A paper describes a structure:
Co-crystallization experiments with DNA were also carried out both with CI∆58 and CI∆43. One of the crystals diffracted significantly better, however turned out to contain only protein (DNA was absent). Furthermore residues beyond Val80 were not visible suggesting that the better diffracting crystals were obtained because of limited proteolysis occurring during the long crystallization period. The resulting crystal structure is essentially the CI-NTD domain, well described in12, but contains six additional C-terminal residues compared to the previous structure, and is hereon denoted NTD80. The six additional residues mainly consist of hydrophobic amino acids and interact closely with the rest of the domain. The extended region is stabilized by hydrogen bonds of the Phe75 backbone carbonyl oxygen with the side chain of Arg8 and the backbone amide of Val77 as well as Met79 π-interactions with Trp71 and a hydrogen bond between the carbonyl group of Met79 and the backbone N of Ser68. The extended CI-NTD crystal structure as well as the NMR relaxation data also precisely identifies residues 81–89 of TP901-1 CI as a flexible linker, while residues 75–80 should be included in the CI-NTD. The crystal structure of the CI-NTD fits well within the envelope in terms of dimensions. Next, we generated a large pool of possible conformers (400.000 copies) using the crystal structure of CI-NTD80 and the model of the dimerization region. The MOR binding has been suggested to take place in a region including part of the scaffolding helix (α2), and a region including the last two helices of NTD.
TP901-1 is a temperate bacteriophage of Lactococcus lactis that enters either the lytic or the lysogenic lifecycle when infecting a bacterium. In the TP901-1 bacteriophage a genetic switch exist, and is regulated by two divergently oriented promoters PL and PR, three operator sites on the DNA (OD, distant located operator; OL, left operator; OR, right operator) and two proteins, the Modulator of Repression (MOR) and the repressor, CI (known as Clear I in λ phage). CI from TP901-1 consists of an NTD responsible for DNA binding and a CTD responsible for oligomerization. The full-length protein has been shown to be a hexamer in solution, where CTD is responsible for the oligomerization state of the protein.
Author numbering: 1 to 80
Write the structure that this text describes.
Amino acid sequence: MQTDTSNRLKQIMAERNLKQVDILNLSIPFQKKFGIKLSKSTLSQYVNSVQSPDQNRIYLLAKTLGVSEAWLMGFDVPMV
């Protein structure tokens, strides 16, 4: 596709003034809620586009940031 998960995370970091450390912080309550872990290292791998998130982390980050899963995956759809 045209857009990556990497691109979307970067779009959110810029538009919402969040660094990776902030996003990771926001996710922790949801990590415990869902019982699904996201480490700092793995998050940077998503941002730098070295790794693409599995469907577990797509859901996690999407609920954390309040965006749609499809959007977060890079698809050309509405954000909310």
